Amino acid sequence: LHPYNSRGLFEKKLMQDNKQLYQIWIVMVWLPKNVPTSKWLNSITSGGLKSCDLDFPLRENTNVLDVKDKEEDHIFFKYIYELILAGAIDEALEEAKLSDNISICMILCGIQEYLNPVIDTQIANEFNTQQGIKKHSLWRRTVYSLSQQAGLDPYERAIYSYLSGAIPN
C-alpha cells in the first residue's frame, strides 16, 4: 500500500481514507446502432486529403472527410452523455468505437491511471501488464484544452469537459 506507488495507489488511498468524497463519486455515477467503419476514400478524390487521420478535420474544416460520420460525432456522442451518468467510461468506449472513430477512442483509454506490476503492488496481481497513462495529469490538462476548443462544436467536447471535471457546457 504505503511505501512507493504510481498514481494508481494514491487514488485508492484517497477514497479509502475519506468516505464523504467516496460517496460524492457514487452519486454522480448513479442515474444499439450498426456502423460499418472506414473513411478516407471519398476525401482525396474531390480535393485534398493528403494524410489520413481525423486530425485533418482539425487542421481545417470538419467537412473534409465523409459527412455521414460528421453525423455520428453529434449523435452517438449524445448517447454517450446519457451513458456517463449511468456510470463508467469503458461503456462509452464501446460506443465511441461504433462511432467510426478509432483514434479519438484512444482518449477514453487515456482516462486510465497507471496500473502496473512495476509500480503498484496490490494492482500487480489483477494485472500482469501495463495499463493506463503515467503522464495522466498532462493528459488531464490537455483534454481540458479541448473542453474550451472553439473548433470543437459542443457535441464532441462536452465529454472532454467531464474527463477532466465538468464545466457545464
Partner: protein, 89 residues
C-alpha cells in the same frame, strides 16, 4: 600496444586491488582473486571526459556493473522490475 594515460597512475593500481577480494590460494601460496567485483567507474576519474572512449566505458558502467533500486517494494516481481527500471533510466 596499450597506451592509456591512466595506467600511469599507481593509485589506479590500488583502486583495482580494492574492488577485488584477494585469495589466499591453497594449490599455490601466490595470490589469486576469489572475487572480482572490479568497477569500470575506476577509470572514469582519470580518463578525459569527451570521447566515445568515455561513453564506451560508461556504457559498461550501466551494463557490466549492476544497477539496483535501494529499498524494498513489496512484491518480488515489482522489486526486480525496479532494478531494470533504474538501469533503464
Amino acid at each position: 600496444e596499450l597506451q592509456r594515460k591512466f595506467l600511469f597512475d599507481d593509485v589506479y593500481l590500488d583502486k583495482e586491488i580494492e574492488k577485488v577480494t584477494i585469495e589466499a590460494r591453497k594449490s599455490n601460496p601466490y595470490p589469486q582473486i576469489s572475487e572480482s567485483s572490479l568497477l569500470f567507474k575506476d577509470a572514469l576519474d582519470y580518463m578525459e571526459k569527451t570521447s566515445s572512449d568515455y561513453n564506451l566505458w560508461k556504457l559498461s558502467s550501466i551494463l557490466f556493473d549492476p544497477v539496483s533500486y535501494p529499498y524494498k517494494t513489496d512484491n518480488d516481481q515489482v522489486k526486480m522490475a525496479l532494478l531494470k527500471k533504474e538501469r533503464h533510466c
